[PDB]
């Protein structure tokens, strides 16, 4: 992108602006444009756009002025080729699979996976006979087996995975299916750009969440994916059609937020991994889940392609449903609510918040404990926060 | 609604608001709520919740307090069940469909259809093996006879239609179709559910681009499907997962336009008219099409099923691309841009502005002539747009 | 504005948007530009525009993209030379004062005015030793021999008046005044530049709370100044110090309102005359206020210099405190508060609304009764409001 | 605020929302309203309210429940009893001025003052006959003598100072003023409540331009003042009069902005200081100021009240005017123009930013040197900062 800028967090805060906006204006932030369609002085010039002889969006569903910055800034982030910005994350992925996997096609990714996309891929992808294998995030046998198995059209999986935090290894996944033709998409949700760069490490897509991290303030839901162009291309004019489009006002809110990415995920990363151990070392806490602990499985993969380990941890209590619940309920400063990554800190307890639906049995099937608990680190200060997480286990 | 609020305006202006938000505000009108997620005071109230005992949208891509008004407002004034908001008119019935049409199953459509709807039918639902016919708008007999031929599971179609406003006798096929169990979505975008009421004419889906006219400020997209809840039901479950959630910002612009729906309908309808008539009697103009004429093949069904007619006019000049060109480029006021229905009138060259892709040939093979010109009569004063039109022939 | 262009409505909707923005963007709409300052690309830049061999801004108290639009607009609208904007007509009319009236300067000015504007006149000012002169807005006597008596240096007022409408012949006074120098500034607030245009008529300074109709929509505040440059430019100046900027996002609204202006004055102007005699005609109904009807003292003026009378009435019901009340809470549709213009109806009872601080006797001192009703008649259907009114009449 | 909340950081994160909000909702940031008035019930309601048996806002000018909690939320950071929020610095300022100092009263304030404010001192204020003496920041002897010759009414000052960041022992002020009844008021707006507590030093008021650091995004203007009820009360009344409203939309940017106060200050008071040094011990570098460094004249009282030094710098280029430029003009990352405290960073030359109106010599008066270099450090890497910096000068 540029010369003068090198830090992440300079690039977080002036990728796509600093330099011009093909928006021109002698303001200092991006102009939020609210327009449904552009407009042509005159037919010889819609011709020439028309006939790729000229440049416009044509019409707000084909993209917006105030979004390409975002656009282009996640993509200097990522350090990709070109980014999509969709109107949430489950968009993303959604359409992106839909986009890319053909019909009776076939896909492989992990076992643990956001409820939402496992559903997508369980009840609407079957339709369009695509048929996926799941595995161990871990298993590379697997993954290497099904790559001889079956023709797989690409691999799909998140790093840091959900709820467990489970990472892979990129780089060698990204060789074994490249090797076989396959296609690999990552999640990096739960990592942020600042923390890994799955592109780099030789994944074909990275994706966010935006809802969460990037705009960290949990006042807006957004997707977004990033990769070659000659890929993100090809879901773009999918999505021109499902029209998925993300409000201007929304983007802005994240361009916003962005500007101070670096100084949270920062402030998230640390707060995160002093409360991690200082929780594994907890009586009370049987186990304790994150990247950043020796105790995690793939920790030295962590430490391998990770920068940091996130702001999220998970952990279970050891008492049962009720008594994790009282933990929980104990708290003063999270909110108890689904989504993370936001300044505010929030916890909750899987096998209530999204898994209540399921029987205790069939919840065991995918390691939801009544016990687990995820708990997003606010940005709140630390002293603040981990005197509150201590005195709620004081009350059991 | 309420029983002191008949007039349609009325109920486009307080629907959903002049009694109760569930949202609880001295204020007048609707606060907008930017949050990505819900949290809960405590975990018994999250159980009672997840055990359908409380209420709460859970995830902004569940709802939004914001948005729910705009939806009943809107469900108030086409006289639903209930209805849902995605974050474009594509999106809505881009899933409508892959939400109630089956697997392999069967839709008739007509063939006046909106470009893009069209390659969504022509190129994905084909994935999911779902076979479609294509009848003309008036041919029941086509209806009728693919109706028994085959088993359709759904008949989809807009009236007015696009670009000639070929409309479709609602009743009589609602009729012909659920006596074959099919299923009968309007897209009555064009109409508004000001001119036309297609739920109470027997369709079982009704759906608009708020893009359009209810926003009528061409600074926003939506789209937004209504009916029966057990109906409208299925889709928004669809929905949570597909995620194309409308942000509030969004929804608010929409509640803001619709403030003022009558009252620009009411000027939108005239001008149309008067202008319509105006346009067929001029020389320069071969031929006009607008369902207010009577020289309208559906004429009558367009009296006897709507109150208006838009405010949206299309018209064959009589000249070649050229020449036709060169009176959209004399205008003045209109903008040239796809879109319509805002307060600021719109042209465009159909033959170049989406379908300029296509070769002079194939361009015909829907009646798209280089001669035809699609006119939406913004809300400006009727002379001024006359005297424009009119200044812009003479140049010819 | 532009040629093409003649009828009010057109104006209010292109006026400052359709040729140009010095904003430059294929968009439709005006972009919202949030920014606090403006940059500038090298030294030599700021040079010239600190030599005024530029243009820019400067700060985002000094101005802004968004808003020098609407400032445009309206500036078309009323046909003036330059128009200002303020955080809220009160900021307006209180800093115009300021502004052009000097220290221990005269200033003469009707009693029927805005209870707030009142204050600071019988507060403020004479802090800075400006003494003031209360006249009524018919005694044109008094005026011209006040404007003897003393050296007027501004005669300001609002016309039609508050919460009777009365109204002034700003032509006539506008020659009085201009004859012994003194400035004319008037608060056609009420009036709307459609129903009226105060410059044309003579007068020096017209100034509405946009707060009201420009917007009316109930959910923004911002008021506005427009005149000659000469003038206007030296209130901007104290403005820009006083730093009362109004906010883009403010800016928008109106300007996304003004959209609809004449479109919702027209109807609003109907429902009022109409339900005005109506009311007139009641029995329960003591007296009714509106230029509109012969009843009204100044009614030969209104219709000299109106095309409109508002959509405001005033009237006495035939009751006590109470009783009056009792009406007004039997109202199902407007709503009980302050402000006024929006689509939604309002009422209130001036007696209390904002005159309860006073006793029953200084009450009067104004004409305040405890009968007085104030109706800001909404955009909403005629029938459905009428019935309610009545139906209200008929609880006493 | 609460008990289980110690840390700033995590007070401006949940400080007036966390516990409750009084607009009652399941979402975790507040909701931004949009209203222009509020209604009531009944009158028998509106009643009580005028009664101050109630609680409402009345009118949208009197407050709204967006802006309470930035309210609120502030109050609690500088806390304070009660503080009031305006549409500008210069607003809050400005008005606080008119409120407290009587007419032919008399105020004391330092030499090193804001442009603007400076004017509204020496033209605005004399008219109300209100007389003032300007002293040197240090000079206590000055202050102590004045506070006896004169009845001073009110000490006015800002602390740091602009633009050499000169110090006040509020402390020692605060009594000396006390002792003779003056009142106290320090404008921290280069400090931040974070840096420090003025209000716990003594002072009385404390305001702050939220347009800098509190909203830290460049992207909305706005004023505050805090202090005890009895006295803020009486600004707010005549705030409720001049009209100058903060609109929500403008509120909630900065409840969105302060969620990262904290993490903003930080990091701008490090890469301050450390360039300051840096600065400082550079060759080209003729004078550095910055309250940080020993170098400081009032360095001491800098850390005796400080807790940072802020991310504003001011120092002297060995170099003429001309010369001085082409360093700016070769800086990179910052934006030449006026404000600071946003994210991103910047650079001006006073001499020509704010003073090239004055005279070499009248420039001088206020040791507006051609030299003087104003850097407002942005919250990007430091590394890429210096840099930056450094690599501007080599040029030189
Ligand atoms: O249960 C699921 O798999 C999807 S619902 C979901 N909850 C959270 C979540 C909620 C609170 C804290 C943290 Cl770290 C995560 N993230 O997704
Ligand atoms: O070609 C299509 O149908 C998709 S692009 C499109 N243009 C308009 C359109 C543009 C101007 C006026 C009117 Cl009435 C309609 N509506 O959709
Ligand atoms: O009482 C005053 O003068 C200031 S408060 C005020 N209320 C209304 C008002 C309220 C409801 C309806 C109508 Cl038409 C006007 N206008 O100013
Ligand atoms: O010059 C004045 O007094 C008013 S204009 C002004 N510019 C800046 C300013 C500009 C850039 C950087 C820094 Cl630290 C400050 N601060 O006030
Ligand atoms: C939270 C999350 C999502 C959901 O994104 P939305 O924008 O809320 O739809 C998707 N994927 C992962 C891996 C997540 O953690
Ligand atoms: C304009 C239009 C659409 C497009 O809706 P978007 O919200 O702009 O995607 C779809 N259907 C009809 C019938 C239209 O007229
Ligand atoms: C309503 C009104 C005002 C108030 O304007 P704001 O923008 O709400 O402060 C001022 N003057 C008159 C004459 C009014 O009628
Ligand atoms: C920057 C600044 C202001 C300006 O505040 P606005 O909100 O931009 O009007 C006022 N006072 C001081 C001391 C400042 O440094």
């Given at each position: ?107 492989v ?26 595995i161990?995030?871990?298993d590379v046998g697997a993954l290497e087996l099904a790559l001889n198995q079956?023709?797989v059209?690409?691999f ?16 060698l996944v990204?060789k074994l299916c490249?090797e076989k033709?396959a ?214």
């Amino acid at each position: 992108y540029a010369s003068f800028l090198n830090s992440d967090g300079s690039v977080a805060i002036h990728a796509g602006e600093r330099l011009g906006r093909g928006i021109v204006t002698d303001a200092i932030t991006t102009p939020v444009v609210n327009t449904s369609a552009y407009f042509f002085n005159k037919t010889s010039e819609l011709i020439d756009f028309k006939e790729k002889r000229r440049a416009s969006f044509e019409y707000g569903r084909y993209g917006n002025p105030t979004t390409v910055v975002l656009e282009e800034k996640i993509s200097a982030l990522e350090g990709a080729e070109s980014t999509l910005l969709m109107a949430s994350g489950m968009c993303a992925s959604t359409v992106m699979l839909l986009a890319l996997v053909p019909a009776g096609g076939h896909i492989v990714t992990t076992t643990d996976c956001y409820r939402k996309t496992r559903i997508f891929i369980e009840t609407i992808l079957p339709k369009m006979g695509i048929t996926a294998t799941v595995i161990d995030p871990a298993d590379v046998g697997a993954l290497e087996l099904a790559l001889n198995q079956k023709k797989v059209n690409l691999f799909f999986t998140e790093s840091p995975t959900n709820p467990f935090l489970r990472c892979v290894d990129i780089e060698l996944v990204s060789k074994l299916c490249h090797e076989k033709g396959a296609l690999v998409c990552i999640d990096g949700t739960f990592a942020t750009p600042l923390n890994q760069k799955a592109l780099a490490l030789g994944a074909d897509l990275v994706l966010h969440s935006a809802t969460k991290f990037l705009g960290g303030h949990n006042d807006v839901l957004a997707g977004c994916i990033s990769g070659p162009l000659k890929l993100v291309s090809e879901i773009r004019n999918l999505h021109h059609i499902l029209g998925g489009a993300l409000n201007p006002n929304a983007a802005y809110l994240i361009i916003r937020g962005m500007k101070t990415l670096h100084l949270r995920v920062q402030q998230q990363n640390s707060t995160a991994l002093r409360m991690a151990e200082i929780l594994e070392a907890h009586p009370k806490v049987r186990h304790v889940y994150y990247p950043g602990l020796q105790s995690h499985p793939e920790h030295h993969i962590a430490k391998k392609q990770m920068t940091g380990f996130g702001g999220a941890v998970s952990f279970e209590v050891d008492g049962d449903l009720l008594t994790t619940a009282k933990f929980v309920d104990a708290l003063k400063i999270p909110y108890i609510a689904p989504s993370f990554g936001g300044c505010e800190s929030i916890v909750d307890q899987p096998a209530i918040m999204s898994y209540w639906d399921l029987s205790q049995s069939d919840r065991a099937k995918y390691g939801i404990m009544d016990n687990l608990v995820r708990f997003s680190f606010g940005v709140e200060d630390f002293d603040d926060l981990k005197a509150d997480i201590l005195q709620a286990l004081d009350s059991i």
